[PDB]
Structure formats: structure tokens, C-alpha cells
């Protein structure tokens, strides 16, 4: 998937904690709307950019290092294994 095919409105939450969900725009230029601040509660490294891969998505920190890799599960859904054996879900809408 090109960036244009992954960009847009996404909802992030930690599996089991769906009530604590954060909507973030993935901008076409591979940045995020300011709302990405919410991922600080969940990730060690706050993401500033993103990049699609053939099978998933990279959230990347300010120094160019990996904040998280998420696997593509099905159309409009990625899931990534976080430290502390948590799963971060990102789904369109």
C-alpha cells in the first residue's frame, strides 16, 4: 500500500482498553495530526512519522528509530505487539 492508501483517520487503542481510544490523522506526507500525543501513554517512543511496509506499518520516532511495527490484519486494521505484552490496535473509523 502507498502512503496515499494508508493516510487518513485512524483510531488507536490498547486491546482490552477500547474505552480509551484516540483518533489520529495519518497525513499524506507521512506525519500525524497533533492528537498523536495520546500514543505517549502506550509507547516508549512517541511517533513523529510513519511508513507503510508490504505487510504492515512502521511508526517512527523523532530520531528515525522504530516506535512500533504493526502487522496488517485486514482492510483498515493494523495490530502491533507492545512491551508489557499489550496489543495496540489501529483501525479506520
DSSP code string of the chain: --HHHH-EEEEEEETT-TTS-EEEEE-TTS-B-GGGGGGGGT-SS--SEEEEETTEEEEE-TTS-EEEEEEEEETTEEEEEETTTEEEEEEE-
Contact 22, 12 (CB under 8 A): yes
CA distances from 77 to 4, 8, 9, 15, 63 (A): 16, 13, 12, 13, 26
Contact 25, 9 (CB under 8 A): yes
**Total length of the chain:** 93
What is the number of domains present in the chain? 1
* Residue among 2, 1, 7 at smallest CA distance from 92: 7
The three three-digit cell numbers of residue 83, written as one number: 512491551
**Which residue range(s) make up the domain with 72?**
1-93
Cα torsion 37, 44, 55, 93 to 10°: value is -30
Amino acid at each position: 500500500l502507498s502512503p496515499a492508501q494508508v493516510a487518513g483517520s485512524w483510531t488507536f487503542y490498547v486491546q482490552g482498553a477500547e474505552q480509551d481510544a484516540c483518533t489520529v490523522t495519518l497525513k499524506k506526507d507521512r506525519t500525524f495530526s497533533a492528537q498523536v500525543s495520546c500514543l505517549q501513554a502506550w509507547l516508549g517512543r512517541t511517533p513523529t512519522t510513519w511508513s507503510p511496509t508490504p505487510d504492515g506499518l512502521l511508526l517512527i520516532g523523532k530520531d528515525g528509530s522504530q516506535s512500533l511495527f504493526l502487522e496488517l490484519r485486514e482492510a483498515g486494521r493494523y495490530e502491533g505487539s507492545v512491551e508489557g505484552s499489550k496489543t495496540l490496535v489501529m483501525q479506520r473509523a
